[PDB]
């Protein structure tokens, strides 16, 4: 329940192979990998209500949602989707996404607070899972 806080990244991996699944170019993949490696996360949690600001060097994005309540966001490659977060356990939530227009890969993300005090974020596209690890700032 202590998801709230300021998180700085310490590990980011399998990122390029997630981007490959969609057709991101090698160059755009590489600069995406470097960008993804500077991510910062700001979380404000109030019960089942979440504000998450994730930012890189030149881009920042916010989401607000309630567990169980569909909301709108963007997949990895910017396609708008409706999303639904559910709890898996005390400190891990899973988010299913469904494309609002057309077809594409099945995408989903997770967030978890470990007992070591790490925030683990994963993002999935079909068979492929990226993972990022953060510590409190
Ligand atoms: C809790 C949520 C987190 C840690 C979200 C992190 C999001 C990213 C690392 C997103 C990365 C990318 C895209 C969605 C598309 C544009 C390029 C990237 C690689 C920065």
From Swiss-Prot:
InterPro entries: Calycin, Fatty_acid-bd, ILBP, Lipocln_cytosolic_FA-bd_dom
Induction remarks: By retinoic acid.
GO process terms (BP): embryonic forelimb morphogenesis; epidermis development; fatty acid transport; positive regulation of collateral sprouting; regulation of DNA-templated transcription; retinoic acid metabolic process; signal transduction
A single GO cellular-component term on record: nucleoplasm
Domain of life: Eukaryota
Residues that bind all-trans-retinoate: 132-134
Subunit record text: Interacts with RXR and RARA. Interacts with importin alpha.
Domain notes: Forms a beta-barrel structure that accommodates hydrophobic ligands in its interior.
Name recorded for this polypeptide: Cellular retinoic acid-binding protein 2
Lineage: Eukaryota, Metazoa, Chordata, Craniata, Vertebrata
